[model samples]
Target: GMTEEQSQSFLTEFINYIKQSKVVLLEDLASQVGLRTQDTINRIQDLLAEGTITGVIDDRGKFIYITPEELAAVANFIRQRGRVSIAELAQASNSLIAWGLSERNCIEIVNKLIAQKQLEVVHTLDGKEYITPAQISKEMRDELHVRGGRVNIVDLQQVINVDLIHIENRIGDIIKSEKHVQLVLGQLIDENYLDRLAEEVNDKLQESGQVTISELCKTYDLPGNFLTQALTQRLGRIISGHIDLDNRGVIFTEAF
Candidate 1:
């Protein structure tokens, strides 16, 4: 058995050796560094834990670097496709960084390919970038321009190879704010709509002899901030004794 200090000294050389030698089993690695097999395996485990080396020792007893070849396939796919959203590419390839193909390596390969006149960046929107050999993959266009006007964002995410955040950003620009609330809540969540909702609340109060603002919010799934604001403003219209303003609750008691 080697002392910790001696092990550390030899491990440095062992790492450099493996970094160059590039392919071997744990036993071969142990032989090169003059350490016992178990000790070599333990040191390798420690290095993996420390991120000093990131390779999986296979069930067949070979240490795999998990880079280049697997990631090269991802790179080649991107090159062949010409362009894809980063999110789409990541999901399509089932990409994860540690102990596997990394996005950094993927980008590097793309850049290399680009320098060689193999591909071009055709779309450069923040979340919608695509790289293609030339005349890159184009996004689907809605003929009626009713995508965000009527299409649910989630539905688009399922059908299109695009992220929701980007879809919503583009939607926010084009869709009317009121329409967004209407599509989401089945009615506009604004002053006039709130006034109608108030009529419903008053009806509830009349029917039940009293009702809670909390109940109305839950029943309609209304926006909390505006609902609270709307009711608070209306509360002043009622005699102070009939309604109480308390946190997390707004009660409509019997009329004074």
Candidate 2:
């Protein structure tokens, strides 16, 4: 028989042990808390009945405590939201986790969701958030159209919301399927832009009699190799000119 003070002390120890260990064998818990097995069981039942703690006594005779308060709260918030993007969850978690979620933890949770198929990360925004794959391609095209058929992938990353490399990946895939769209040194250009560009370059070539690849590269901010190939591909078609045989870099009009 224990006195009132002794009973209170033993209960506190028993609760603390359970709280800390989370899953403790009843026999071990009793020994650790200096109580007999039956006393530990009685204390556990009283705690459960009074709502001081919540858990289950499994068949293996282990006391498995309920979810941690913080974890449960976060899980509850996520549940209430129905469906949430991993990045959105990470952002919202700021309100719960306090301070902020670390980049490492954010990725860890994102990968965890991927494993469970609860979420999938196709494109990340600075590793903090991810943009939907379907939306990103359309958004990139929209931004490109808004910018008049040519836009830097970095600008896409900024406007569409994701990493530049992911935008580049999307661009790579898009150009292969959509012949009109092309990627050149992080620049996304469409047939409309290239046609217009070729016409403009032709005008320059005719007016100057020759337009060097290096010169056009500077004017259009395109790499020399890509611009050269792009112009060559359009020669006699969109561009009414020819690459000078002796000077591979120079495009000369028919008159020149």
Candidate 3:
């Protein structure tokens, strides 16, 4: 592990080099930083641990890398598209080079982008993994200038006005009476917490159909481990049955 100052210095120099080149090998990184290959590798590992860079093995089993700047660009892409893949990253990197980034530096920068949490690695249906920026945090949204914008949910109501209280009462009544419907509603309410009297309604539903954490996450496209852990903290055990993972489907235990 590098001393904090050394680590910061190394990262600063590394980022500057990435901005100039495109892709870099470990030996090249070592040479540029005036360190032995082993020392450079250790530093790189430290950076990786610190979420400052990312690396992946190439076809030849050599590590390829990326920088934080490149990762932010990839994140912007995800914000626009909702998701991206490794192929998309490759194409986007190539485009970045065409627009001015050095071809050699682009590859390294892409890897670094992954290290910074701006992108994440996920498995495809074929079991091959791809990188994408699927989940954007509040900090990221603010950095990307997407936050603070007005969202007009009530605009829809203007076109077709409906009684909000009546809707809530009817839903609440249905939720209280039906097991499956209550389960579904409870799951939604727990996750979002924006619905009317959601806490009270969820308590009423939880009495009949035991809503598992996994079921709730699937209904909202949340990562399973994250949801399960959160639920464990709140509800104790990891529950299932509300969601059918194999089919990617969810069903309520009772009718509305």
> Which of the two, 1 or 2, has more lDDT?
2
lDDT of each: 0.52, 0.67, 0.44
RMSDs, each prediction? 14.8, 11.4, 18.8
| TM-score for each of the candidates | 0.35, 0.50, 0.32
lDDT of 1 by residue, 90-158 (tens): 466444323332344345445644654544444354545564423211232241133432334566544
- Model 3 lDDT per residue over 1-256, tens place: 5456666687787777667654556677777666787787766667656765564433422344544454566557656654345556565754433333333434445455465455543333432224232222222222222322212223212221332232223344433543322223222222322232234325544565545445566554556565444444333122222433344333233422
TM-score of 3: 0.32
Residue 152 of candidate 1: its Cα lDDT?
47
Write one digit per residue (lDDT tens) for candidate 2, span 1-256. 5656667687677667756676667898777656678877877778766767645565456665544454455555545553346667657755754424544454544454455455434645544445555556777887888899988777877786666666666765687767888877768888888888999988877788877787788898888777777778889888877666554467777855
The collision pairs in model 1 are: 82-131, 82-132, 83-130, 83-131
Candidate order by decreasing lDDT: 2, 1, 3
The alpha-carbon deviation from the true structure for residue 242 of candidate 2, after best TM-score superposition, in angstroms, is 3.4
